[PDB]
Amino acid sequence: ETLNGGITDMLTELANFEKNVSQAIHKYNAYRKAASVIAKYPHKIKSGAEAKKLPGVGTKIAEKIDEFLATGKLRKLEKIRQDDTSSSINFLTRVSGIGPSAARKFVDEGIKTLEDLRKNEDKLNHHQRIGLKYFGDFEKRIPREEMLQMQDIVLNEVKKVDSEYIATVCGSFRRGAESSGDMDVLLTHPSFTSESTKQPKLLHQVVEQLQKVHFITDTLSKGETKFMGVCQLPSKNDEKEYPHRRIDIRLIPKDQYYCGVLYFTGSDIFNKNMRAHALEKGFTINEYTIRPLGVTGVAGEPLPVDSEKDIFDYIQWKYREPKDRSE
DNA sequence: CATTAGA
């Protein structure tokens, strides 16, 4: 957690580079299990050799460790951090829409900067276009004060269209967070569960609603169960307009909400931990359900859920307010 | 780890 820091961070920097700037999925995979393993190790790595005893730890990384241990740096690390092309890819990727593949491509093309991207808005797809259009605002945080106002409106039209709609703003927001990065809304309707073969419109209805009133202003991707947009709070009585903000809506079988809700609310650790527990408590938790284990090794048979509570009750735990679902 | 775009 800190004894092995520098090794782990250098290592991940090592990993992420083969992954993006190069196409070294393997090398890249390599740096991670190592950076993972050296993370666990309860003692101060003193030398490569020492490290080396480890699992996944090879000659290659070992060699790494020493230079890092010995000198407060790493050239390869110092040469990449410097490398303009490489840099370039790391940069371009901030463009929502831009992944490594694309990054590289554009680079090969000569497109390295933001401006480069403007000059060739053609070479870009709608997504990317957007991305590009909302780069600053996309990278900005979202004040809960704002989280509140958005949530507000959103629950309004939801309700407005059909009063039989259940929305919940999951995530860190849900979890009290003084700030968030994009709002996620979990949706469901009685009229849609596991088997009841859809009602795409279900989703449809609402996005449409949101647009109609100006909530949603773009569309990144609209599907029958998963919309992924952009939003903006009606800039008041002038002098102050709201920045563009990512948003995502999702349909869900009424019959699989709460798990989902439970789930999406995190925190990553709260989940894992709760989940781990469910294993003792003779169960299984996953993003959609909760099945009772059968000694044979495994089992199934999704237990019925009407609230965040059922799941809790199920594994006989203390209801944890989302506030303190931190871990 | 599943959903969407796109070519």
Next chain:
DNA sequence: TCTAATG
């Protein structure tokens, strides 16, 4: 169809 990009 496969491939990329989000989450």
